[PDB]
Amino acid sequence: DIVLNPLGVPSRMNIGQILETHLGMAAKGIGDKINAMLKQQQEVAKLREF
Amino acid sequence: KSDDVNGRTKMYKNIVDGNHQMEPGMPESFNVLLKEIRSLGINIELEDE
Amino acid sequence: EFDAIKIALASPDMIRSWSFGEVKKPETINYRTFKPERDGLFCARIFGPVKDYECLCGKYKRLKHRGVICEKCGVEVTQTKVRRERMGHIELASPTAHIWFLKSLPSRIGLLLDMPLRDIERVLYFESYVVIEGGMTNLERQQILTEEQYLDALEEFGDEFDAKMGAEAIQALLKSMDLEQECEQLREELNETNSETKRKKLTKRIKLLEAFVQSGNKPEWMILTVLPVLPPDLRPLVPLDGGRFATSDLNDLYRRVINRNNRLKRLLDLAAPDIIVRNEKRMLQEAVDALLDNGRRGRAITGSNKRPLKSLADMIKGKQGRFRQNLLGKRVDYSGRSVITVGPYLRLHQCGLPKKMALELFKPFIYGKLELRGLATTIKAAKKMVEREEAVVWDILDEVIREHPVLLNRAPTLHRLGIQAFEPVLIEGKAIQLHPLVCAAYNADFDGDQMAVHVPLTLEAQLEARALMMSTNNILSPANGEPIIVPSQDVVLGLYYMTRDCVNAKGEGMVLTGPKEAERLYRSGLASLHARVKVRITEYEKDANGELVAKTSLKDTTVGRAILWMIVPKGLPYSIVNQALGKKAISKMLNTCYRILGLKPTVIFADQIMYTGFAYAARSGASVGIDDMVIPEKKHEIISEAEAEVAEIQEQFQSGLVTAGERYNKVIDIWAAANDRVSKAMMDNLQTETVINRDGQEEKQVSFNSIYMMADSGARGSAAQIRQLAGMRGLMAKPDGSIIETPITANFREGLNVLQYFISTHGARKGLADTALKTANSGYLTRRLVDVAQDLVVTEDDCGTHEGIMMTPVIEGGDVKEPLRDRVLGRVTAEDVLKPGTADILVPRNTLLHEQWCDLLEENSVDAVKVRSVVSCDTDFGVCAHCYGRDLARGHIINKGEAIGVIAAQSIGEPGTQLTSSIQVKNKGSIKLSNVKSVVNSSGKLVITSRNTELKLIDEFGRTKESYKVPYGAVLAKGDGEQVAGGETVANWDPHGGLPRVADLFEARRPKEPAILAEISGIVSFGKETKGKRRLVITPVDGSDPYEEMIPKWRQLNVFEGERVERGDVISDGPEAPHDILRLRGVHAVTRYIVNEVQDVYRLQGVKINDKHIEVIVRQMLRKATIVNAGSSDVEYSRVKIANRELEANGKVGATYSRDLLGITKASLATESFISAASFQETTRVLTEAAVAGKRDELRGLKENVIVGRLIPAGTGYAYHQDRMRRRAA
Amino acid sequence: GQNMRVAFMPWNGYNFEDSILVSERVVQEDRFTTIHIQELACVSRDTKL
Amino acid sequence: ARVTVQDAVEKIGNRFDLVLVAARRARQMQVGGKDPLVPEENDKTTVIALREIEEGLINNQILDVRERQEQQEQEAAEL
Ligand SMILES: [Mg+2]
Ligand SMILES: [Zn+2]
Ligand SMILES: [Zn+2]
């Protein structure tokens, strides 16, 4: 979507973007599996299991 | 570009004739300053050509 | 049509001259017809017609019968615009003093009679009478009396005795006064009677008298008999939306004056008592004074609104309004603004301008160019054609833009580079594209900053935007020769990334033909970019007579530096691309390029560097993640260790082994010395982090950590932000400065906790507010600088003085701060400088000391150069090109006409926004003492006895590379002229700022703890006991001995009693006063002092400015002087220096002078041009004073011209003024 | 705000100082297309004529 | 797209007289009173003047000679 500048962190400490990106990548990776099991219509077992 | 009631008009009428040449006049703000100073007990004037 | 502006007193008849009528009824537009009323404040008959070429009655409408006063209304049908020129007057009934000539600090009417102000103010309020022209009676000519005093006084002398009360009295006193006879009497009172008290006001009263006569205007005019009114167009009553009318406060005040004058006349003819009429007279005076200047008597408020109405004088002065927001700065047509962005593809000379913006801007060009090419019938049709956005008009716009430079401006304009001319590049959208290389000069970011565009009109303004303001013409700043165009963040990072090498890159150590093959290796994906590969490269180097000779050979390099070599120009060698290529390296490479190949090559080199940088810095990955920050695994320990190091100090203070302010430092020192541990833990682990096997042998090299390359390249990340990034971030202190004994112990990666963030919040707030509220400070400083500078321009070819300031390197304490070569480069010699052997010539009398002579003098041991300066230059109302120097966007001599004053003021004002044991010799040489008295003692070694003592080092060259000061009673181990080893301790003893600073340095303010100076040589002596303070006598040697002084005993001394001490000696400690530095030393000593001090505050942080600029300010500070004798002559230095020297060329005796020291704000006060003074200074005062004197301004300068709207006498305007002024007055 | 897939990396200086480089996909899905509502009214009022 | 006038200044190096002279010449070509002395490669009068300066075939002195000639030219048409 967007391409920022890496040089924009190490001056103004502002490290919140760094970790917001990692946590958001993980939070979207979980949704990847949720959407896969929704599209593959596997069953209601794997849904709860995950 | 600011003052000179004649300057704006002359420059505009020249810009369309392909002639880029200004005819500077007298900034109207300065004539107004002359009024505001001369309306006081101060007499301001101009001399030779 | 004019070349002189004069200001004189307004006479009660010269007022009736302008006035086209007498406003009688205090009325306006009627109420129901909205038409002007007869003899009102808007009367068409008095002032002018309502409509254009139309009468108020409506009988004459045609433009035919113009000059005629229709007997119906008396309104001459003419241009309605004349209602702006139409003055008027009011026949005031009782005389009324002009407030300006009574309230200004040098109260004009006050010292016009030597009458104290508190007396005239009592006379005006009708609270006391005053005698006038007694002749021969019991009373004087000027004497006050009360009710009971005037009661039985007329009986004593009915005739020959007159005594009035109020404004009539003041006026008639000014009428019968002789400004001639009294003057002849005040001449002797200044002649015989000594005692400055007898000369305080007299020396300024004689001047007011003689000038009051020389001008011509009479003293009776100090009282306004007729009050002139302002044209109704300068105080409109115009209607508005909804029907409400919008008027000016000038109206309300005028209406008041008219009402009260009418009421007074009605009483005077109605036979009223005195208690009523004397109240009416005072109300009239109140209204008139509040009309001229509201805020000096009682601040008469307005009507329904509580806010005080604005008076006449208030419409002139102040940063707001006229003279400051009108005549110096106005809004302009043919302009715009927008949010600016990137634009790398653009060249260093072009900028992206949004299409629609260009359309709206060049509308007047578009219309004409369309009607010319047979595409639009007439101008109106072209308007509709562009209003419809027809396809053809886009190509027409592209034809009009073609080579038509535009101007871009960044909101705060510190230096001249704030406005730069670029070549338009039509672009889609609404954002303004800006070239990254110029972002430094503009000092702008892409976080939402906006810039303004300006379109030139005249062919001149289009040429000046190409040969003066164009981007590619401004490369090296005028403040300092360093280029203002240096690669920023991404560029330097890409280059540094290429110019790197690890050890084991894919295919390293091999050989290739050259750059072509190296790039064939990189792009293919077969070779790396950081390989240590050595290849062949042809490095051109024009040699031996100026003939280019390409010497090809092989060198050790990397695959990356060899590729970057394809951008490098011809003349430059390969040694410039053999390093890590940091920001501080790319910059100097570009600088050598500039002063080797010229302007034209340097430009294209910079553009190429930018493109290549951005590309490579992009494709290198070059990112940052959470794992990049390497928290030293030793952190935990390093923390807890120093965390327990205080547990002993705590008991040390709990028992009584150390007091509070004693164990405080015990915590502070262990914490400061422990922070280096945690800071260096990640540092030495991050400067050699990456570990790889060279061909199969484990080894560590310069780390490749993403965060670290950004530091070693200088791209963005500095060093401190790294210690904050991975380790804990230091200790903060409360606003008190009490550093807390509770440092931060957690880093930024782990995350701060609630408690720790509070102290960070205070630190943040202090930084934020201290930087935000500082804007106005730096702005104010540079503003006063430009106001002291402007008129100073480069006119004269050569002055003709050998004087020259004495340039010597700063060498101080340990090592040099700035070599002699810098403070002498590009300047001019004053006297022939020779080799270390006398009777030689290394350089002739005066010659441009460009790089060549710099190297030549650097070869020899000559560390002392005599360079001419602006502080000393024989020139009237200007400067000579030689004395200034050369520094500019070029290495050539300063041109004849550039206004060096403004550029210097900016050169100091822009860097303003950045500011807030024994001795151990290092180098080997010989001890060379300077100005020291010594004596042998028990130990046999030497000891200093003079407080001042310099410790130079005469090496095998004969120069000085060491300079240390040693206090009284020191331990010496060599002596003067003695050999030393590699760092021998020859000294030992028992030791027992910012922008507000430079402000004081310029203002010549007197120090808090001054230090007395000597006025002559000879043994000093004491004197009378302690009475109030103390005494001190001066004992000269041969000449007269009348000098002495009183120095308080509560202030310790330093000078030796029975010892010779030359003039200008340290009679005490403490700071020094520049005024006292001019008298006892001279004109060069004081400038050498101010420059050396002001340069230190800037030298602290990363600021560099050639001494030349500061010299110009110093020269402007001593433009005044005081005369010692009278001589054959009948103040300004230049004027008297020419006027008395022309008669001194004649056998007649000259008159001696003494330079005075005026601060930048006190020197900007006195100026030949009164208009330029009243522009920024206290207008109300300046005009009053320059009005009683009948002063006459011929403008001769910059600000005055921009006021009257004329070509400034500088640069392009200086050539026009040259051709005009030549035949002018000749 | 909105969820944007960010990636810290330079791109031909298109972001150079603090400028932001956005994909075309974003401006296509109308995920930042903010709606505005201006209010411009006309006023017929009695005049001198 | 005239970017740098370095060589143009070299002929008259004053940096201001350049502008005055080039403006006189640019007028001559724009406000119709003369013809170009260099092949006009779509270049504006502003740039063509600087190019004439560069070639060394136009300056203050040369134009002062030409105008002085036309001074007598205007008097040789009145008998
Ligand atoms: Mg910003
Ligand atoms: Zn009439
Ligand atoms: Zn000089």
UniProtKB/Swiss-Prot annotation, chain B:
Domain of life: Bacteria
Quaternary organization: The RNAP catalytic core consists of 2 alpha, 1 beta, 1 beta' and 1 omega subunit. When a sigma factor is associated with the core the holoenzyme is formed, which can initiate transcription.
Main function: DNA-dependent RNA polymerase catalyzes the transcription of DNA into RNA using the four ribonucleoside triphosphates as substrates.
Protein family per UniProt: Belongs to the RNA polymerase beta chain family.
Record's protein name: DNA-directed RNA polymerase subunit beta
Gene name linked to the record: rpoB
Curated annotation (Swiss-Prot), chain C:
Cofactor(s) for this UniProt protein: Mg(2+); Zn(2+)
Cofactor note: Binds 1 Mg(2+) ion per subunit.
Any one biological process term the GO annotation gives: DNA-templated transcription
Coiled coil: none
A GO term from the CC aspect: DNA-directed RNA polymerase complex
The protein, known as: DNA-directed RNA polymerase subunit beta'
Binding residues annotated for Zn(2+) 1, in chain numbering: C55, C57, C70, C73
Chain segments annotated as transmembrane: none
From Swiss-Prot, chain E:
One Pfam family of this chain: RNA_pol_Rpb6
GO molecular function per UniProt: DNA binding; DNA-directed RNA polymerase activity
SMART domains xref list: RNA_pol_Rpb6 (SM01409)
Cross-referenced Gene3D superfamilies: 3.90.940.10
Record-level GO cellular component terms: DNA-directed RNA polymerase complex
Cleavable signal peptide: none
Enzyme Commission numbers on file: 2.7.7.6
Recorded superkingdom: Bacteria
GO biological process, one term: DNA-templated transcription
Reaction catalysis annotation: RNA(n) + a ribonucleoside 5'-triphosphate = RNA(n+1) + diphosphate
Keywords: DNA-directed RNA polymerase, Nucleotidyltransferase, Transcription, Transferase
Family, per entry: Belongs to the RNA polymerase subunit omega family.
Functional description taken from the UniProt entry: Promotes RNA polymerase assembly. Latches the N- and C-terminal regions of the beta' subunit thereby facilitating its interaction with the beta and alpha subunits.
Assembly mode: The RNAP catalytic core consists of 2 alpha, 1 beta, 1 beta' and 1 omega subunit. When a sigma factor is associated with the core the holoenzyme is formed, which can initiate transcription.
Name this protein carries in UniProt: DNA-directed RNA polymerase subunit omega
